[PDB]
């Protein structure tokens, strides 16, 4: 049951193993807090494996977050969906720039600084822009779920859904 | 023209000078970045005046933010509306607890962790809860502007309007 | 003819000699370029009189500009209406903040960074805010002449008329 | 997703790679401030690449600005839309001369010194004139969006829209 599931997930990772242009360490999600909102997880790679603080973490469908602390053989990763996390993004098709902030909900981000009149709609893909010099650019982050316009305010309300699996992830990739 | 305006504002501060239960230093807003979104300001009090990092800052109508760096005679204050700022709050009437995050818009906060079914509505007052042990409790923070409910997601979307003046403030109070 | 005119203007200056809260040097406008758009003038005070680069210059009705270069007994002053000049201001009544830029026209300024929905109207007085730490705050700068709203853009177009006389000024005051 | 987008943008640059008459360095936009009004950006070329202070910067559709400071491998570029920036221009068809100033809005310039009666209309193309000896002449700058005439004042109000992408740009060209 674990050997099947692990194989399926591993294959998916091999199919998306060409999405990177560098060396990536295949680490597994191991320590997780029981509460289903704890937007921070642990990985089965650490210092011995060359993992460092700040390192980006992704899966076969999206950027997941960043390492925020390292142990000899394990490490802690803050997910994009944490209220404390922000990532610069852009709408894939047109290059419209924004900041995606965590909401504390496992399945939602919110985009900041999107003009109320901006060309953005449900289903548009957001990808990393790299503009904070933390993440490689071009990797999928989320898809727009909703736009809410607001009378008198400069910026629209934009809710999005991460493309990575967050809570339902198995194995994770660390970028060098 | 400055003597009139300054007097009006000062009076308002004297009328709300009984809202505190301790000693408060009356400081003025002095250095501000030209850009009208820079959610961070400076004050005309500093180290010489006993101002410290972390100190809460408010006006006659709301909590404004916190000191984040000190100079001999001036200081820098991060406002609640900054994307990096979060404050624990509660709905005044019923005690429903939430986290108010800055949106980067001068006139808006967003509440996190509010159950989709929660008893919250447009016009409800949010006040500090003190639960992060950073702010005194009971001081006005914002009023709910909008609730948006979301199918399948645990938490509602709540937008609120700070009660303090943020960008349109003159003088500020520092709590000891 | 010059003794009458000079007396009238001097009196007006004596009536507005209580608008300052410090020592002010009464200097006259002396060297001016023939072209009626040259938004830069000279004054009959200089180094010998303690005039310095950066010093604010005003008349009985408004801030006029700043000294930009000093000579033994004369000095050059850049006016607010020069395209290269900007001054932080605020709407007197409500404290709405903005940047007033010179237009190159002797009788016009333009305000930057005023929300399209902002509470501003024809006849509102703008005064210095001091927020650039160059000018004393509270001194009259201009009155709003026109608001033009713009579909899709965040900021309104605001044209204003300086309260100082610019080209039709006689004598000028330098603030210490 | 980044490889597609980057290819499209690169092609567009190859199609407009004949607009220059000299050697141009293809640099990418890398460091950008989160705030969506910060009219200043960074490029992934610098001193090592022969980039210098003052150097003009453009894209496939317009002049973008100028380098204002150089680092070993990166550089900072001030955009035309910054309130501090001015560029001499001319109406393409008739040669009517003007100064285009930044407004602080990402999508707007304003023309100075345009006679109220001047032959200028919505949709006219403005191009660099070279007359400040900073920019090559003939390169597209903006298109007129609006003319507002003003009773008693010599100069019309002219708002224009840059042809370059400013905030929505990917890669940039530096002119030698």
Author numbering:
A (entry chain C), B (entry chain D), C (entry chain B), D (entry chain A): 79 to 254
Task: List sentences quoted exactly from the publication behind this structure.
The elongasome, or Rod system, is a protein complex that controls cell wall formation in rod-shaped bacteria. MreC is a bitopic protein that harbors a large periplasmic domain, whose most noteworthy characteristic is a β−sandwich core reminiscent of ‘butterfly wings’.
Negative staining images of MreCPa lacking the TM region and the first 21 residues of its N-terminal helix (MreCPa(36-330)) revealed organized bundles that associated into tube-like structures, some measuring several hundred nanometers. Subsequent three-dimensional (3D) helical reconstruction of the MreCPa tubular assemblies showed that they are made of six sets of filaments consisting of two protofilaments organized in antiparallel fashion (green and cyan in Fig. 1e, f, 2a), with the core being formed by direct interactions between the ‘butterfly’ domains of laterally associated MreC subunits. Fitting the refined crystallographic model of MreCPa(97-258) into the cryo-EM map confirmed that within each protofilament, monomers are ordered in a polar, head-to-tail fashion, with the β-sandwich folds contributing with complementing charged regions towards formation of the interface between two protofilaments. Three main regions are involved in filament formation: Pro114/Phe115 (Region 1) and Glu188/Arg190 (Region 3), implicated in lateral interactions between the antiparallel protofilaments, and Arg175 (Region 2), involved in longitudinal (head-to-tail) packing within each protofilament.
